[PDB]
Design a protein around this ligand. Sequence first.
Ligand code: MG
Length: 1052
Amino acid sequence: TNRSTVKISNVPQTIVADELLRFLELHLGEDTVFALEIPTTRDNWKPRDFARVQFTTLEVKSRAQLLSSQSKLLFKTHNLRLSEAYDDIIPRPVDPRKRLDDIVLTVGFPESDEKRFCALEKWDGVRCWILTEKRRVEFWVWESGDCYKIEVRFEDIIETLSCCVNGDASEIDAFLLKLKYGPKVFKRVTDRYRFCKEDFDFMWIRTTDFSGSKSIGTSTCFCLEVHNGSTMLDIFSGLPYYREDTLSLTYVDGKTFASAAQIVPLLNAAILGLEFPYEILFQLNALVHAQKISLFAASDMELIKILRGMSLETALVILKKLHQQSSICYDPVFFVKTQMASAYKRLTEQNIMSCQRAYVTPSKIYLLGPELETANYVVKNFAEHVSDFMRVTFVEEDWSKLPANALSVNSKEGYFVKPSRTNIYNRVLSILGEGITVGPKRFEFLAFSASQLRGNSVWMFASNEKVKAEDIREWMGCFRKIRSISKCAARMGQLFSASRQTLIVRAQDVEQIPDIEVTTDGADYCFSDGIGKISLAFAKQVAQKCGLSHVPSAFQIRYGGYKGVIAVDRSSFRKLSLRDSMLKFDSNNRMLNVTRWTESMPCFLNREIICLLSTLGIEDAMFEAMQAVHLSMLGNMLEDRDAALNVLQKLSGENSKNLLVKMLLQGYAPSSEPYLSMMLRVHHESQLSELKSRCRILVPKGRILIGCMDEMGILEYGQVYVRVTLTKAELKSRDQSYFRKIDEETSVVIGKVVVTKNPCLHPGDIRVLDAIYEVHFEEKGYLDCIIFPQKGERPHPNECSGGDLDGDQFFVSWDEKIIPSEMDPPMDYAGSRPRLMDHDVTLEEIHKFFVDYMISDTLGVISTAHLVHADRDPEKARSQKCLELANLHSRAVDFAKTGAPAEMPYALKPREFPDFLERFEKPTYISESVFGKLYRAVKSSLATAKAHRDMYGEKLTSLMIYYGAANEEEILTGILKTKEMYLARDNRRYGDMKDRITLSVKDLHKEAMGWFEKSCEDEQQKKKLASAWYYVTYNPNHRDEKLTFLSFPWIV
RNA sequence: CGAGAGGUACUUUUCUUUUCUUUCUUCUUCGG
RNA sequence: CCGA
Ligand SMILES: [Mg+2]
């Protein structure tokens, strides 16, 4: 009953569409058929055995279905059989009243504090199709001959009104729409088996704004002027968030805001003066980009004259309160009347940097503000022009990922197909080339990081008087010796990691050791991928600024364009020594910084891990017990204190000294202590949710740690040594079969482990590596580093999908329940041929590589198609459709390195999803594999003091509404109970705000210690004043009418 | 009996399923 | 947000 398009099962193949049209109009009524389409295998001379017919109403569709079920449709000795189609031939609503024809559409925004409306442009004679089934509305705006489809979804509309232009309340002739996001703009571009009854033989492509004055990009409010709205109120009541009230308006003249730049929603800084500060104007413009202050409410002189002469802190704390409230403030003058050093010091201690984040849509721009992000190397060596850095990302109108059809649309012209670049392509290229111009500044393309390329983000810098965009680029190094287009861009994002700086090593302290390599059977291999050597004391001097008591044996390090780990030798003689396979460019700096050193974090059992280990003769029955042993201590965590220590000592951090571990041993029951009872309940809800969503079966006998190679020569092909550290449960039973307590903290292994990587798809990635013991290996002090053999045939890191040794993880486990004795041969490791140019990079090929990284990026579908093609097909991970996908994954993960795309073919998509997915829109099917059993196994389980308190309250309650958190536990833990529209489809963008709220509340915990030491410096007398802080949050008599917080006094 | 002319006489003699693809715009995976 |  949703659609009227009917698919006929058996039509004759000797007919034309007119013969079927006349037959259907002879049996049914006259001209009751809207669309008719017979698909052809060839171009125009080979029709197929079925056809699609779309009727005008539902009654004639039901009558045709009743005639077909009674066998009364005989067309040339063929009984027609009707069924249901997949979609409409033309996206047209089947309603005679919803198709509003020849109406007036005008755009604008409320100008003054009242409910007025200023019009920029006016469109006369447009269409209006309200698609209830597809949950969108579309307009057809004709301009200069061609038309432009403007698609507006239902989720973008937040307020539907009923206005009146003519003044009379009974003459309802206007409908005001309030759009949170922007609309999708389309364009019409320019025979025998299609009748179609109208002019619909064209195609829609996503282009930029069509108006010469560019009014649509600053048109967050709409006004649908209808001819006569009397019975249309029953149709407009189906719109979401429809306020059932009649309200008048005033049509203000608004042709003043007429810009010609690509960045439309910006205030004219030349009119208000170039002497305005950037810190206030950027926040005032970001409030305009949000749905709090309109354009005319901020561009008036009564707001600039009252905000120009003031201090910069006082004018910012009253502008942050405008973003604090969720109500749309119509009069900003009335709010600021009721509203009335450390930043440079706080960057080198906790890597706190406030960067201006932007979101570029195909229509407008969305500036957010100086958000707290992790400071990298470049902004820490450039801590004087922090207001010139900007993170720019290219997203959709609803802040989602840009697909491959919004730009570079394919069109078969001539003999072969050719991709056609639309107006979004030339817009993103113009933005990357020229730049954006907000305030008295202009942001130029600096570079982009390795993860910025996958997330479609880029770094931008403004050329000031001191430095420029070229000087900061040549300060990193010289990139003229790289003749590639992808590698020259990838080496400019190498020096952008989230690191902590250390002392500078001079240029005289270099020692180049000649490397080692093996060439077996014509295949080139190497053992010194990114490894190096370091001394005993140098680890102490590099750990003196990080606070590491336990000396790590291997840690990833970077300086001067070199990348990889370094190992500790006990026969060291110099301070620093380097290999030759670290050089990427000839830099001119040698400042040292460390990203992440070493951590003995226990592992989990991922989906591809089960997919690759349920093939080698290991049974599927133990995978349910491996999660049953976890849920037996996870389920009774809410009502017991014994399982609460075991489910927190190794779940999130092994030696994790946090607030949940100090009150775990010397603590009470979870019935009392609500500060413990809240976070433990939300950790239980997190542990069930991230187990139901993805496979995260925890095992205590396995770890995850960074590996390195050692210069000993004893280790051979097939034998390593694992000197793991003893956890809180490893010291309870030292006498084990495969484990051996060599010391108190160091618990070595004597069994056999499996070593793989985090992405793995080929069955040759599984390899058995026996842990042996030697006195020369135990005397070298290889703590928290799985060492690798020096010689052999090929290196064992390279056996795990061609992995190098440059600061990457390794999944290891010495469990003895599996049967890994069956072994498969490995796959190839050499990628595609590199592409070298005959000239130098002119800084436009990097723009082309960044824009063409969005298209032809099928990395998101290969791991999905492999996981479904291993569920639906027996002899999984060994069929040909698994080997082609395993080759395409290794070709697609090198797309950031070399410029060779993946090109995911057709007849390989599954078109059917298993049970263990969150895709509730696809026609799914019940999975019979072990993954469906593991998905059902969790469904079987789920069946003086007052001033400080009041200032902590107002310092904490703002970021809940600012981030979208409804409670304190959503923002103080990391995981929010509610999700947004674009965050429900992007895990990487969800992790951004997940880390960003923790990095935000870290500074709140810093100022909670700062105010505590500002109140009293004595520690022995602080326990008597902390009792009052506990009593005002525990006792109900000291609780005021506001919602007080219980996580306030728990600072230590 | 040899030469020159015209005539009967190789006719399809090996094409392969006739069911082969357009219902399209869709979550990379891991750890801080 | 960052590193395979
Ligand atoms: Mg690596």
